[PDB]
From a paper:
Two structures in different space groups were solved by X-ray crystallography, one at low resolution (3.2 Å), including a guanidine group; and other at high resolution (1.8 Å) which presents urea and agmatine in the active site. For 1.8 Å resolution structure, the asymmetric unit of the crystal contains one chain of protein, an urea molecule, and agmatine in the channel formed by the loops A and B, and three manganese atoms; two at the active site, and one at the interfaces with the other two asymmetric units. However, this agmatine is in a non-catalytic position, away from the site of the Mn2+ ions, where an urea molecule is present. The presence of this agmatine probably comes from the expression and its location does not allow visualize a clear role in catalysis, possibly being an artifact of crystallization. Mn2+-bridging water (w1) is possible to identify between Mn2+ ions in the high-resolution structure, which has been described as an essential nucleophile for ureohydrolases catalysis. Two types of intra-trimer interactions can be observed, one formed by the association between two adjacent monomers (monomer-monomer interaction, i.e., A-B) and the other where one Mn2+ ion and TRIS molecule are found, implicating the interactions of the three monomers (trimeric interactions). H-bonds mediate a similar intermonomer association between the backbone from Pro240 and Ala237 and the OH- of a TRIS buffer molecule. The solved structures in complex with guanidine and urea provide insights into the catalytic mechanism of the EcAGM. The primary interaction of guanidine occurs with, His126, Asp153, His163, Asp230, Asp232 and Glu274, whereas urea can interact directly only with Asp153, Asp230, and Glu274. The structures with guanidine and urea made it possible to propose EcAGM’s catalytic mechanism and provide evidence of the importance of His163 as a proton shuttle and a stabilizer of the transition state in bacterial ureohydrolase.
Agmatinase (AGM) is the enzyme that catalyzes the hydrolysis of agmatine in urea and putrescine, and to date, E. coli AGM (EcAGM) is the best agmatinase kinetically characterized. AGMs belong to the ureohydrolases enzymes family, containing all the conserved residues of this family similar to arginases (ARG), proclavaminic acid amidino hydrolases (PAH), guanidinopropionase (GpuA), and guanidinobutyrase (GbuA). The hexamer as oligomeric state tallies as is described to other bacterial agmatinases and arginases from bacteria and plants.
Numbering used by the authors:
A (entry chain A), B (entry chain A), C (entry chain A), D (entry chain A), E (entry chain A), F (entry chain A): 11 to 304
Write the structure that this text describes.
């Protein structure tokens, strides 16, 4: 083989027909953006994450694991959703259709954004297959705005509870450091207390909030402090280090995580690919916690 | 005066109530953006142009003129349109209302984008006051797409002729170097021939196409080659130098230019403010050709 | 209102005649620079802070407060000092005159630099109205050089104690990580110990040093580690995180802070506006600790 | 189709098994680098060109052509050579093997570098299928060093004539502006005269030097002036504009060009993707001159 | 003196003939690079460190020391190794020869890379003069690859123990956060535990592993998290802060450190010189711990 | 020689005691800056030019010359003036003293700025040795301000004629594109006409203005368009290409040029070292036109 099908995330094989493949996990890129009050995310966050992820591919057993995820899980990259270039409605319809087809086939999904709005169609499809979920949500923002429209940025986790896709009472939002509503049922572990508490202390509280519910894990890269993730459309100071974030993600290993995504990487604002690298490393860690179960 | 009202473009006085002022020309910022197939323009193009324009303010008589524009014209900066943060429809309604109020009062407008879509509401208001206009359009793109919707990026100069706002047969598009429709009535002076012909030759042809019609002058900064204007959402190689562009704009002096704008400056892609500087210099040149008449 | 007077810091109203206004607090920009042994700060630090501060304006009650500062305090932005473009003497004379006029009128000041030298004229005016003050000083540098001239960079807090403007014995310098003089009366809480101690421990010591004296709060952004504040003229490694800095500023709430500034933001060295964002967030936090008293 | 095989250059279909496909032209990426006396090219030049090429894909008939290349030519992207990460010998052996297999199958090649050294293995394979070729070589450097080793950077066009792969007497080197050997048989059209002469004049001379020989076209992006192509390992001032370069490439339409490449794009030194964009546009123009024959 | 010999690191005197000088310590630059699977380091890491080090030179007694290193140690900068531009073998032969000549003369060495491969020739020369050493190694990578060739990147600390240059059983690797071999005798203090433990706790363990052996101290700047050191060829998230790193280096004061280096600064990926600044500050701290003994 | 005295511009030997050396030409760096109305130049322009100049050193006979300058001229680099870090008066006194000592010894000078103000002390020393000179001045600015003080930026060529150092009537200013005084005796060849006329036409006019007077050649890099020289404190659009500038400098070969400098390179605003590279190439061309006479 002089040229090869090893062109996707972590040099994994591409499969443009994933639904009836032998894959366990399928990576989908959704380079969807919408006009915001601040900067736009752009159309290259899936591409920047894939490109920088070659920094991680040489490790046979990614630190600190004692196995190779690739020998426990069959992971393929199906490329990008064609309708990510449509408006919020068109993108949502096609993404939910893509997701339902994969979940019905027994595949699970790691998806890369794109604006955080991509998580709402994913949650609609996941709720159909797995039932109402607990949300584990890393972000500087709660995204529970209740006064905007159905397709507005920052409203996904008002709509999701209203549609019964997630149980807010068993959901946790980690790293929040912008105005939020204390009485909507979500448990907000704000960045101030998360930076001051030990990882094990936070993880113990997350496990007790989530319980045994199926979990959708959604990681907005702007959860990280802008020193570690300058490449994002809506930065907020006082965030998490990449050390603390990856340790928190590893601590989620014993949860029943049924799907996950990483969103808001904005390459136009990245500095020496550090934001894309943090996103790729967190995404690989999400695959490792799944493979640790097998 | 220890602090002062000299905070706008070229340190000109700000006036947030311009409609009944003594101004001859009013500068308006429209930091409007929409989701595109490529990069987003962002919300700081008016701000970047204003900021860098201090490089030009120290010249009493801006080169190469033998007068000071500020002693012939009363120019104020009214800030930014509040609805530039709305969708294409909301922005258009408010911008056209703003423009009609200024033109009805006898003011004329230099406006800064923002996406090129801002020119369509401006043309609607200008046609009401001045009648059907000839368009002088600098761009790498013709923006005459006829198969998208009424608020889509790149459709403004299909809609404008259809609404009778401009006469395409007396309009000229300069710097085009992307696919265009040869039979829609616009005269396309593509960048290949514009770079090969003398300025006077091009200007003579523009004057004969435009004739004596009132002219709306719209300058997309991506008319300049990306070496001179890297800060734009839709770059295309093989463009104009800033030398040739400013010489072409100066050659328009004898036309009856009733309004003008400069659009598509994307500061997130700018390099050492050169794109914003070129936009500010072209905008100042547009004021000079007006003041040269007085 | 199609265009509006909401063009300043945090989109607050501009008022170019603040002295007899209804404002409680007035923001002044001083884009003053001087030749240094290292990099120059430039003339856009006030502008970069204002521009990025729109990221904070959408929060009605800025996290983590349970009120809106804008509903307790009348804050206006008076623009920039005209003489910030003069030499150190000319700038100082005009800034002190500006400040005395505001303080005599019962206004208080949040000022943005510009070089740290701007704090000396501010302290001269503040001492006249409030009496000798305790200085709370965040910096990597003590700025107590005693062998340079009266207008040299880095000498302000040798001159201030000599002129009786501050009491060094009740002043504290936080984040210092460059050579300093242990016996000049200032209490130096160096970055090594500040990074190792709890916030509450540091705050308790600051309160006991300062006591009940009126406090001038001056924040050099290079107090933050260059990972969080690369945009500064004189970076030093081993600094504070933005998390720790904002927590320290919040802990100053119960002090009698009569005036404050944020200096040394150098946009030419900024990376994705993170330094300007940290400066804008710290400045907003200073307004919140004032509004928390009302 | 919710996800698709449209992930390569210009969103063309990927085919990891191109040798027995229906393709007419096959794109291969060779992200090969070697230690140099100056900067290294890196491993992302194929990826940066592919990514930015989406700016060109929306044009059905790319300006200024009156047809769609994609409706005359079947072009696929086979990804990257696996051995581009080996040393100069390992890469050369695998690339020549890849190329021979494609040419023997009747495919033709557009290849992207990577260091310019990639052209030597390509020429070895092309000479086998097409016979000794005339080289049309755009570069600031002649790459005819005769005193280094067989795998050294900058020696390819000493070795190629010695191995009988090209006829130097019918080869032309365009844009040269570094020390060269006047008596080695190549015709050097240096950047000084190329910038001063008309395109048609240069093209007429190229046609007479090349005659009817089969042509290998190799474009080092550092032929362009660093204002247009800052993203390259070995910049030299006084180069070609992208306007002149694309016009020169279009003028080669009537030559018998049997293979072509674009090399030396160094994304770590690129500014707002302008170098990658120029490389992608030149590469698309090379496909258009081929499709213009059909 | 109108011009002066104060052109090297920290403005120290240059001496191009250091071997028979009065120097105690000699700084050597080795701008050596080799083709890697990731980015290349480049040829300006010695130059970038020297340039930014002027930020530290103004401190007479560098914080937090109570003496001036320059009054206890005679330090000169001998410039760069001429053969750093050769291949791994040529560079190694000349560097080891340079080092042996200095050590035989009673000088000690602070060296700047360049790729980490430069440490292997340095260790060969140091073992000859000081005997088998304990290695104190800061890195995200263990560089103990045992399946590559003798001159490959990342193999130095497989070869060194095999040649008896270091005792792996008394060596410690700090900050590791990539796949490593647990049973090769090195003690790996990975970044996860180093970030969670106190500095004194880590230092106590290092002292007990190293004992009284002579120590070679080698600092790969990619030990720091990419937020603090973006300018490096092989970044890995979850690293050390510059605060923790400098505190760890200061804690090594009581060890018998016979030579030291700082490697992998890649200026092409640096952001506002922060990586070069951290490297220069760590290097100055290494000189201070030596001067603290005198 | 394992390390070497080849650390200066073009890897030429450093000589910190140049006055009694065997040098014909001596390079001096003057990293002098002063507070301006725009950006500051900084303190690294000499260093950035030296660093990038290694791109030119490998050419034995620099293109397009048929000799090696280094075999006709003995050129050394004496480093930087120690007082460049003082104020305009202190710097001027020391620079003029440095220059007088070199010129009295029969050396000639190529100097690198630093602010353009450095040329005034150089002209004072040159007039003493060579007599009143003709100035050949490349710039976007005339620097003839007559209403500022004796040490202000932009006043040098008001003061120089007043002190009889240059004859304005035989001096020419090339590339001017900012407000200038038409009646002060200088001949202004503005960038508009210089870009439109042939090089030979401009050179013929320069030769006739200058005649046989001794010439001081001073090149402000902001003569180049900001696309080619973004790294400068005072950019102005519509400038010269680097092709045209180097051709103009080569055409000055037959003039009696007694000294020369290159100023205003501001590395903080440079993009991929292109401005420093253009400055280094122009400086090398100035040495070649001198060596062409021998
Ligand atoms: N939350 C954000 N990401 N941006 C600000 C928009 C305001 C929330 N409706
Ligand atoms: N024309 C542009 N600016 N972008 C590409 C969109 C395609 C035109 N409808
Ligand atoms: N302290 C600084 N900000 N810079 C260094 C100048 C030396 C103190 N006189
Ligand atoms: N030619 C280059 N690309 N670099 C300089 C190396 C010297 C030629 N042997
Ligand atoms: N370890 C590195 N620095 N890079 C990856 C190469 C793989 C180790 N042989
Ligand atoms: N000319 C400049 N370089 N800057 C503007 C200052 C105004 C001239 N006195
Ligand atoms: Mn979010
Ligand atoms: Mn968010
Ligand atoms: Mn347009
Ligand atoms: Mn356009
Ligand atoms: Mn300070
Ligand atoms: Mn400071
Ligand atoms: Mn080449
Ligand atoms: Mn080349
Ligand atoms: Mn840049
Ligand atoms: Mn290493
Ligand atoms: Mn490493
Ligand atoms: Mn950057
Ligand atoms: Mn000048
Ligand atoms: Mn100038």
């Amino acid at each position: 083989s002089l040229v090869s099908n090893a062109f996707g995330f972590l040099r994994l094989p591409m499969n443009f027909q994933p639904y009836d493949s032998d894959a366990d996990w399928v990576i989908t890129g959704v380079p969807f953006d919408m006009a915001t009050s601040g900067r736009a995310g752009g159309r290259h966050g899936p591409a920047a994450i894939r490109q920088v992820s070659t920094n991680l591919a040489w490790e046979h057993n990614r630190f600190p694991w004692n196995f190779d995820m690739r020998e426990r899980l069959n992971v393929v990259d199906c490329g990008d959703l064609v309708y990510a270039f449509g408006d919020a409605r068109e993108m949502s319809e096609k993404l939910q259709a893509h997701a339902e087809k994969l979940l019905a086939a027994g595949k699970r999904m790691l998806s890369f954004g794109g604006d955080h709005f991509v998580t709402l169609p994913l949650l609609r499809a996941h709720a159909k297959h797995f039932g109402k979920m607990a949300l584990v949500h890393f972000d500087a923002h709660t995204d529970t705005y209740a006064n905007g429209c159905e397709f507005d940025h920052g409203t996904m986790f008002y709509t999701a509870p209203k549609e019964g896709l997630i149980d807010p009472n068993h959901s946790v939002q980690i790293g929040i450091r912008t105005e939020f509503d204390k009485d909507n049922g979500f448990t907000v572990l704000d960045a101030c207390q998360v930076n001051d508490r030990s990882v094990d202390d936070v993880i113990a509280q997350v496990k007790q909030i989530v319980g045994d519910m199926p979990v959708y894990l959604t990681f907005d890269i702007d959860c990280l402090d802008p020193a570690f993730a300058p490449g994002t459309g809506t930065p907020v100071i006082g965030g998490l280090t990449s050390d603390r974030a990856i340790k928190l993600v590893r601590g989620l290993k014993d949860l029943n995580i049924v799907g996950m995504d990483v969103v808001e990487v904005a390459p136009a604002y990245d500095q020496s690919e550090i934001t894309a690298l943090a996103a790729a490393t967190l995404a690989l860690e999400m695959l490792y916690i799944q493979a640790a179960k097998k």
